[PDB]
Amino acid sequence: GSHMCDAFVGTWKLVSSENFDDYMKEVGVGFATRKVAGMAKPNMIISVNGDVITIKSESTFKNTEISFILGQEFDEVTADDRKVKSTITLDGGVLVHVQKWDGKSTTIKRKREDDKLVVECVMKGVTSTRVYERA
Ligand SMILES: O=C(O)c1cc(C2CCCCC2)c(OCC(F)(F)F)nc1C(F)(F)F
């Protein structure tokens, strides 16, 4: 029945963001998309069905959905319209999401901390932290 990844399941709303604009610059997002994407207040809906995890983000800018099995690479179109190759694993209770494209890489870690879901993103040393709470 239950799995350790069940502490991520639910509906989550963004409550704070730090340095996201700079992270998006590093990733290569252009001005207009950065401004509109940075303005978004996404909710994230995380569900599990068997081995398949689904993460949906809903906002006024774009809605995105990925479904995956841990440790099994998939192709993803990101909200900023990159086409990337992604792998997501669980490493000591942290969901680790690596995206690779055009010889570049970025890592997005998701962890439960108290009542929050904390998202830490890094690209070439540029960092962002986004904090979600249950909706
Ligand atoms: O989870 C997040 O809050 C998050 C959210 C977004 C989107 C979701 C839809 C509305 C606009 C922002 C995102 O987009 C990708 C890029 F940032 F590159 F534009 N990246 C991340 C993150 F990097 F942190 F995983």
Swiss-Prot record:
Cited InterPro entries: Calycin, Fatty_acid-bd, ILBP, Lipocln_cytosolic_FA-bd_dom
Entry keyword Acetylation: yes
Main location per the UniProt record: cytoplasm
Superkingdom in the source lineage: Eukaryota
Gene Ontology cellular-component annotations: cytoplasm; cytosol; extracellular exosome; lipid droplet; nucleus
Residues where N-acetylcysteine is found: 5
GO molecular function per UniProt: fatty acid binding; hormone receptor binding; long-chain fatty acid binding; long-chain fatty acid transmembrane transporter activity
Binding positions (a fatty acid): 130-132
Domain notes: Forms a beta-barrel structure that accommodates hydrophobic ligands in its interior.
Known role: Lipid transport protein in adipocytes. Binds both long chain fatty acids and retinoic acid. Delivers long-chain fatty acids and retinoic acid to their cognate receptors in the nucleus.
Descriptive protein name: Fatty acid-binding protein, adipocyte
Organism expressing this protein natively: Homo sapiens (Human)
